[PDB]
A paper describes a structure:
GenB2 was successfully produced, and the enzyme purified close to homogeneity showed a pink color, indicating copurification with the coenzyme. Although we have made several attempts to obtain the GenB2 structure in the resting complex (internal aldimine), we did not observe the formation of the Schiff base between the coenzyme and Lys227 in any of the tested crystal and solved structures. Based on that, we assumed that pyridoxamine 5-phosphate (PMP) is the predominant coenzyme state bound to the enzyme. Each dimer of GenB2 has two PMP molecules bound at the interfaces between the protomers. Residues of both protein molecules are responsible for anchoring the coenzyme in the binding site. The PMP molecule forms an extensive hydrogen bond network with protein residues. These residues include the critical catalytic residue Lys227, which interacts with the primary amine of the coenzyme, and the conserved (in type I PLP-dependent proteins) Asp199, which interacts with the nitrogen of the pyridine ring of PMP. Further interactions include an interaction of the main chain NH of Tyr124 with the pyridine nitrogen of PMP (all of these from the same protomer, here called A). Tyr124 also performs an edge-π interaction with the PMP ring. Additionally, when we superpose the structure of holo GenB2 with holo GenB2 in complex with G418, we can observe that the substrate does not cause any significant conformation changes in the region of the substrate binding site.
GenB2 acts as an isomerase, converting C2a into C2 by changing the stereochemistry of the chiral center C-6′. Four genes encoding PLP-dependent enzymes (GenB1–GenB4) identified in the gentamicin BGC and a methyltransferase, GenL, from outside the BGC, are responsible for the last steps of gentamicin C complex biosynthesis. The structure of GenB2 shows, as expected, a characteristic PLP-dependent enzyme class I fold. Similar to other enzymes from this family, the active site of GenB2 is located in a deep cavity formed by a groove in the interface between the two protomers of the dimer, and each subunit contributes with essential residues for the substrate and cofactor binding.
Numbering used by the authors: 0 to 414
Amino acid sequence: AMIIANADGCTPYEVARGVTIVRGEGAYVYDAEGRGLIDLSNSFGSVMLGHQDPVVTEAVLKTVRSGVPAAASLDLQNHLAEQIAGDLPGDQRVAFFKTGTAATRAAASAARQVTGKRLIASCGYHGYDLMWEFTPPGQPNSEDVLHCYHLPELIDQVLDKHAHELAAVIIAPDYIHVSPEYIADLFERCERVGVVTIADEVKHGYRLRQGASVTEASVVADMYTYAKGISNGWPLSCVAGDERFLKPLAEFVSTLTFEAPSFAAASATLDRLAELDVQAQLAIDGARFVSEAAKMISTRDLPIEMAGTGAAFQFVCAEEVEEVLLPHALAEGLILEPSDQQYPSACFRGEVVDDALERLDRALTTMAAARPDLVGREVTQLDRVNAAFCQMDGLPGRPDGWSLDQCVEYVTAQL
Ligand SMILES: Cc1ncc(COP(=O)(O)O)c(CN)c1O
Ligand SMILES: [Cl-]
Ligand SMILES: [Cl-]
Ligand SMILES: [Cl-]
């Protein structure tokens, strides 16, 4: 009777609200009529290996059938921490949580404890907690967090005004609409004035490479947060970082922080990502998908542009165009996430990619025939900016011809 209060919100599979998903296996989910759909949501990117991965499933099932209680499997817990710490440069300790929001709030709390300072600066989305609620540039939210929307000019403003008062800056990286060098510059500006940095890798950690995405962008951070990439859909997250920041998290423990099934899933997941060369293969397979998708769009003269590549790409279009693309893709058995990147898994390889392209080709054909008025429409700068803001929760640099004031006005109007 709408008794659940937080069902409406940022849940995946909104495009499929008119259908009923009952099964998942590999690259596919299946509806109640037995129809298979290629899944590019993958529980908002939490499923990096594929649904019902055989190795993850056997590890979980063995742990469930042992009945071993929480916090008794010390070797497994420490092994997982060693796996995570060993993929980061430096000497990290690891504190485990159950959601990405818990991990980012804990990292912020650790910075506050060490520095004795309160204010936090932020780029991107860090979770549902009120401390991560977006407010206009220069306006601290109810928990003393300032939002900079990935603009170096807005970072500079906060640093020029509060750098001596900042406990930390927390940046969720993204590379679809900006370069690795652009992201690195955001971190470096804060580093140069001595501000603690948190790389929020909840989305991209273990997706783009076997470790933190920022490492390949020539960035090091004081703490890193992970969740989606590490556990194939099981509820586990962490803060990994330098000892001086991880020591204040010693008592950040819940009754079920160490429930065994999720640790078994995560340790198996990290091993399988390495064994199957997942991120490097996705870079190849996703690049092929995005190139061929772009060609299909072009021959059909539809107002869509592909952005990104590999494991993180996006169908850039106006909202009213996306609202046609998504149902038409669903009708052809292809689940796309709206107003975001797509999230292919390790099973998005081989014949699955060709299957997805065939379904997209059919969807583009029906879309052009159902909505001939969209054929030949141009994609505008505003379309591109809107799509970036939806995807990365910030601006992809100051758009051409926009003043900083226009950027601030635009972001304010999105809230
Ligand atoms: C970049 C990033 N940071 C943190 C979070 C919050 O994590 P969670 O949804 O697991 O609470 C999310 C959403 N998963 C995210 O995309
Ligand atoms: Cl599959
Ligand atoms: Cl939690
Ligand atoms: Cl800029």
